[PDB]
Design a protein around this ligand. Sequence first.
Ligand code: SF4
Ligand code: SF4
Ligand code: SF4
Ligand code: SF4
Ligand code: FES
Ligand code: K
Ligand code: ZN
Lengths: 48, 96, 125, 210, 700, 106, 115, 87
Amino acid sequence: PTVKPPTARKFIWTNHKFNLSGTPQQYVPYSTTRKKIQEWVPPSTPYK
Amino acid sequence: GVRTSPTGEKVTHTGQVYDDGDYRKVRFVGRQKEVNENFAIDLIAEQPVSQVGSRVISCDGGGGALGHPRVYINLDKETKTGTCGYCGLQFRQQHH
Amino acid sequence: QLITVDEKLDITTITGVPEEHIKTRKARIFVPARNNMQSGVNNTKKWKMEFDTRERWENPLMGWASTADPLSNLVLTFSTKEDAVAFAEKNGWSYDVEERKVPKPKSKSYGANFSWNKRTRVSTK
Amino acid sequence: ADTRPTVRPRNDVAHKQLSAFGEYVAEILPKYVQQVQVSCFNELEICIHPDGVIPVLTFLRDHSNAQFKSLADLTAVDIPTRQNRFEIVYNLLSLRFNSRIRVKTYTDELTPIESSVPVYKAANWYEREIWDMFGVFFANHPDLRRILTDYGFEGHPFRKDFPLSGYVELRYDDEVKRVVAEPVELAQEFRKFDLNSPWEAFPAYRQPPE
Amino acid sequence: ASNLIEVFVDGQSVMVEPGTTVLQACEKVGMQIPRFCYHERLSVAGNCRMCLVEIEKAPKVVAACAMPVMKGWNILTNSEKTKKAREGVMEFLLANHPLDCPICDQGGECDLQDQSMMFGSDRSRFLEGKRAVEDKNIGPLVKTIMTRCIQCTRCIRFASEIAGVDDLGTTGRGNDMQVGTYIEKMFMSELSGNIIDICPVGALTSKPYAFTARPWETRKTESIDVMDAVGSNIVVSTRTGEVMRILPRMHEDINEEWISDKTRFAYDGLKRQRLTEPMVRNEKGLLTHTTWEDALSRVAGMLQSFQGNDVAAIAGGLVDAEALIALKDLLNRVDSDTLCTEEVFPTAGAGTDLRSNYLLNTTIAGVEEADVVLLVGTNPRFEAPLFNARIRKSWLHNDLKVALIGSPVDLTYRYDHLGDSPKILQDIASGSHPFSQVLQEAKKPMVILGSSALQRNDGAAILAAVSNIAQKIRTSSGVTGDWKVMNILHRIASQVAALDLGYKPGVEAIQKNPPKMLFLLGADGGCITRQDLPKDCFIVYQGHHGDVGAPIADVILPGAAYTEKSATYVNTEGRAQQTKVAVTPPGLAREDWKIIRALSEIAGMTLPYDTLDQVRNRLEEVSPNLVRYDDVEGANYFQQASELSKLVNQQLLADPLVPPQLTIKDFYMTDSISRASQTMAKCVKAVTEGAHAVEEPSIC
Amino acid sequence: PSGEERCIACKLCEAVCPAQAITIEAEPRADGSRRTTRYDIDMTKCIYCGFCQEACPVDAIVEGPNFEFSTETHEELLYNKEKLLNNGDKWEAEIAANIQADYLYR
Amino acid sequence: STSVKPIFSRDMNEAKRRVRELYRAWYREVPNTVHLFQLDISVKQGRDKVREMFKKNAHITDPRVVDLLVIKGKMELEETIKVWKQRTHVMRFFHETEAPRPKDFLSKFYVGHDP
Amino acid sequence: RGKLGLREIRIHLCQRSPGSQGVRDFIEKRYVELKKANPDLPILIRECSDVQPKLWARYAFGQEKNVSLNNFSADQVTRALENVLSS
Ligand code: SF4
Ligand code: SF4
Ligand code: SF4
Ligand code: SF4
Ligand code: FES
Ligand SMILES: [K+]
Ligand SMILES: [Zn+2]
């Protein structure tokens, strides 16, 4: 890389991180979508 | 564009966050929720508009065969810029 | 050399399916409806058999679609309506048959677009 | 052999020779042969009544102009629309004449098929595989039993109506200290795709309207 | 017959009526000729040129879509000449087409993609730049990406001939020819969404469905629309247990292959305001989530304490038959017969005894045979969009005469406006009105009265007055005998099935005898509030949406929606059709009849059916036509019903006839599902506030 | 280069994936762009065949040069969109050079 | 037609014979199996299960369907006698981990949509 | 209230079948009298092809009894409806 440097992009990481498995920085999967069906919210109004 | 919810959890670029009472946010306790910090929407806004001098302009995203398929964009409308379907770059027709 | 067996042919006991998915399943026999987004008719040539849809839920971890139904993706293709019924009976599924819907032939005329006294005249081309 | 770089050339001498031998076999065993066809890529198939297996396989093995000494394979195909849903396929090889031939027959769930082990000892395990995966029973077979599926496995997986993931799945249970089978539940259901195009691709295979 | 002439198709003889085109002759031997501009339900255009085919001994190729066959032609649909014509034409189509397939919703279900694979070449020799076209904003429903347009002009023909709207046309000339409205206009119509389906390319796409799914990953569930009484056959597309879109399903006698925009774009209401868990009133007076055990125990505790008139029920507009029979049987075992519907149909005379009184006896397909049609107090364009489309088809192809009594609403086809007062019905009977002759001389007359008219306090009179006219026509030997004249056009998907089950139409019975316990089985109309009930009435609401009925109930039992159950509905013409489960009910919701069946067992009055087949064997007993699916029966005995009609004479009100729905704005939001939809909300805002008001990015 | 994601949610990778390892959902982004809201790879389903990168029209999904990413738990091998975006940010320097070296063969 | 090739039995009387024989071999076997496999069930529970399996197929009347049922039952026996199975396969008949599944309408109604 | 009070009648007949001729004849001639005779008694006539004619009566508390009308004459039917009423 000294002779042939890699192209510079602003989004590229500056600080390389090693395998973080088994540490408090490990990757935990999760769903990245929002709730599908919205539930009807009962009125706070009490009238009967 | 990484804002946090009132609970303390960061919101993702898709807008997802665990609501106040969801138990599934326990999976992050003692660990971390991975959120990419470079929001594609905010980065593609920063790009300047490209003033051009023809009615039709073609974008391939750059790099020739390392970009996206080549698309021809119409710039007749004055009220708005012309945007690339693939890469999101904007174009305008010059002084016209 | 040969024997004479007359009873209704049934094989539910030897096929190996559980009872839960023989008795409570409602097979559906039909010709698929043409996808209206296209004009091709090559997918409306054969009879299909499918079963009733059952519950799918979100996987708690990744949000995927989880199923407990082992027949959800099962689809069978038959040449004729009898074959689909013949297969469904010997496997002991309750079924419903929907008759094929054939496009009604139509009278098309180009000259009809330029009519002296009729409302079929077209105002544009 | 033509200057069409991308199109497979036709060998017409092979097509003629295979058609001549198809008649020869049909002339000699008319009691059993129901159809003879040679494909465009030169492959002869003889369709026979299920009762002619041993006479047909024996004739092809032992005749001085057949000499199909080698059973290359033996398998079944499931076509649920047919009344005899199972089609049994025999692929044979002749080293004397450097030729191959396919013999096909049919059966149903409740019709046995004569074992060919008397003709080809290679068929012993092939028929166990056919029984296990397709549930087609072979009569007079020295030792018919499952060969691929797990012990106590209910069903015949290679039938078109057997679900892809089956009905039961195994895990280990701590409480009973053994591997337990349970009804299958997938965290992600297999996603079925409808890929068939609504436009006809091959007019040469168009079937006559109802 | 001797009409038929003989033609050959690749040497295969077929006998065809004279005037059949080459493209139709090929369809009889099972072949499909490629096409882009031809559609069997539109006028022939002949401009795309993809249908070009060779006739043996004919030097030139002919447009198969527009060429009548002549005796003794051999159509060569697979000759070298035919194939090369197709390859040439496909090359021209793809020359200026954009490279959008990855970003184009049409990808994977595109006739240009698929016919390019089958009949086009594998490579391009086009070495120039391509055309680019600006996009038009023709409303909040159809997204336009007109660079993809191939100028087949299908959309233009559909709007002109099917929707009766002339907003779309071609401006310009040559390669610059563009499709659009020229001005800033929105092609807003009850049938507007249909131009998406007929457009063979991604030029016109659904805005609500944009980007969300691909064709190959969606499972197709054949079901029925319940947004109106026409019973349009649809396809519910689902992916991973989620409803993605609604497509039409071809039914020749019902909706052909169209649907209304409420049918097409109201499915997003199923994703909002959903009732997902049973709710009961806490001590403080608010509704709280609770288990099915607590909820049903309360309802069963009250149900047993009452008898007879005390227990009443109202059936909403989207309720299925299985629930209707289940609820009825439950209230029978407490000796109640106050089984009501929100819709009002006069009970005078025969009433619901004879099906002919409240059915569309001519059938939807029949309108194509009528020669005169009388519409009374009904806006068929909005109450039954697909019925009015059938009217325009006959008005256009058969020269149907249409007359209307009621407001001067726009039907998209010119009609004779007899007037607005109900008294005009009296005149037609006497013969004073000049129109009375047209009905007399007409061989196959048809009279349509809309259920919206019968909601007037004088509804009994109007039905009798209109039935008076139909009786005159049939008596005179002008009619063919087996032709039926009197027709009722319904607007509620559950009205006909309820009537066939002995329900009492309207909420007059409840007002006559206010109940102690009331079941609102999906009733969101607002007909019965708490002003109209005793002080402590025990309302129990069962439905799939929280809107008007739920907020006032004591116990809410969440139910399924039409996309989530295999239920039976009967359309205005009497045809019984069944939905299928596409996705299951959300959360704790349960199928409607199972809720009532469970309520019985906790009540003690256990019902005699515990599966869907058994509850459908019960429907056979009550009315044997509720299990004949896709079959129209027929109701005779108009003579008998007419006689009972005159026994009591009532006075027509002096009020003019005005349909509830007068403009497009009143069509989008008419029920709980469509009121929840946000596509409909943007449609209402678009037509009212203004066209330009709605404008969104449409980059791709 | 600007920083916008290359993926346009065409789902060609999901359709081709022999192992059905990819799950995609999409919608119109706040600026009307065609972008995914869910992109997941079950790395325990994947066979590392590289059909998905062959099928992608915009070089959005790639198989990188990293082969040392073994984990201690199964859950750490179910990648969502954030993880794969972070891998792209982490390894772009090398990935781009490898594409530069082989794109002419492709 | 109704003329069909037979597997073994040419009528139900012969078929019921082989059924009867196969039950003898299973009835004798359970005492051995409960020992060789070191099962935790009593020989009574084992023999009841063999009775249960034979009972579920009572209605069958086709001679050919019965032949195959016997053929399959013998293959099952051959695996257990020759100890080709393992302790796990033999105990799969008893479903000792599957929790009680209700069969009354209200119970199925509370839990889920399954019919 | 009262007990065993007839709450409803239902007559199911075919439209073209031979064995439904009596039931059809009854409707044409006698039904109008019946309805006037019993103004508030729901009498539900439901035609469907290839049904076997039947008479369904629902009493108080959801008790139903069915009476076949197959191959009955009009007067034969009139007795049945007479029998149902007043019971
Ligand atoms: S309409 Fe869309 S999918 Fe069809 S060829 Fe054009 S860009 Fe591709
Ligand atoms: S917009 Fe679509 S339907 Fe209309 S002319 Fe263009 S391609 Fe044809
Ligand atoms: S490399 Fe993995 S994710 Fe990509 S197509 Fe192959 S199996 Fe699917
Ligand atoms: S990664 Fe590529 S192939 Fe997959 S959806 Fe995105 S753009 Fe399409
Ligand atoms: S289909 Fe004939 S020219 Fe278009
Ligand atoms: K389209
Ligand atoms: Zn670009």
